A paper describes a structure:
Human cellular retinol binding protein II ([name]) was used as a protein engineering platform to rationally regulate absorptive and emissive properties of a covalently bound fluorogenic dye. We demonstrate the binding of a thio-dapoxyl analog via formation of a protonated imine between an active site lysine residue and the chromophore’s aldehyde. Previously, we showed the utility of human [name] ([name]) mutants as a fluorophoric tag, wherein an active site lysine residue ([name]) reacts with synthetic aldehydic chromophores, giving rise to the formation of either an imine (Schiff base, SB) or an iminium (protonated SB, PSB). [name] functions as the active-site lysine and forms a Schiff base with the aldehyde, whereas the [name] mutation is assumed to eliminate interactions between [name] and Lys40, an interaction that could otherwise impede imine formation, and is also required to promote Schiff base protonation.
Subsequently, our investigation aimed to alter the polarity of the Thr53 position, which makes a water mediated hydrogen bond with Thr51 in crystal structures where both residues are maintained. The [name] mutation also red-shifted absorption and emission, but far more modestly (5 and 3 nm respectively, compare M4 to M1). We next turned our attention to the entrance to the binding pocket because our previous studies with retinal showed that introduction of aromatic residues in this region leads to the closure of the binding pocket and results in substantial bathochromic shifts.
Residue numbers in the entry: 1 to 133
Write the structure that this text describes.
């Protein structure tokens, strides 16, 4: 399904450190972030997404429209300019963030009862699994 609506609670988080290191997130932020449970809130209506990722100490907002390129200033992460585009490849939602970092973006998809989020940067891949609240 393409329906990714809901409140999603983190089950697993594999190689978050490697992904964050590839982004040049500072040491101290990485050490805290890797231990925290994330909650993802996704409001999806047609092509319009409003999403939030939240933890005890960090929060990451991003809204986008599928198929509409948008500039991003990742000021809370690694503080870079990227040109972002989110599109569907089958039932996989694919974000490419064009900029300095190669292979930067993510892929989100539903498999049974779970939401998968694959974060990429450089040679690093982080795989997160969420289940609905």
């Amino acid at each position: 399904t393409r329906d990714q609506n809901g409140t999603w609670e983190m089950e697993s988080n594999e190689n978050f450190e490697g992904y964050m290191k590839a982004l040049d997130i500072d040491f101290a932020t990485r050490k805290i972030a890797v231990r925290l449970t994330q909650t993802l809130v996704i409001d999806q209506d047609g092509d319009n997404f409003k999403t939030k990722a939240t933890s005890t100490f960090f929060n990451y907002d991003v809204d986008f429209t599928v198929g509409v390129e948008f500039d991003e200033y990742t000021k809370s992460l690694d503080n870079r300019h990227v040109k972002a585009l989110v599109t569907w490849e089958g039932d996989v939602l694919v974000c490419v963030q064009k900029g300095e970092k190669e292979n930067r973006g993510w892929k989100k998809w539903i498999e049974g009862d779970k939401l998968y989020l694959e974060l990429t940067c450089g040679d690093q891949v982080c795989r997160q699994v969420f289940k609905k609240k």
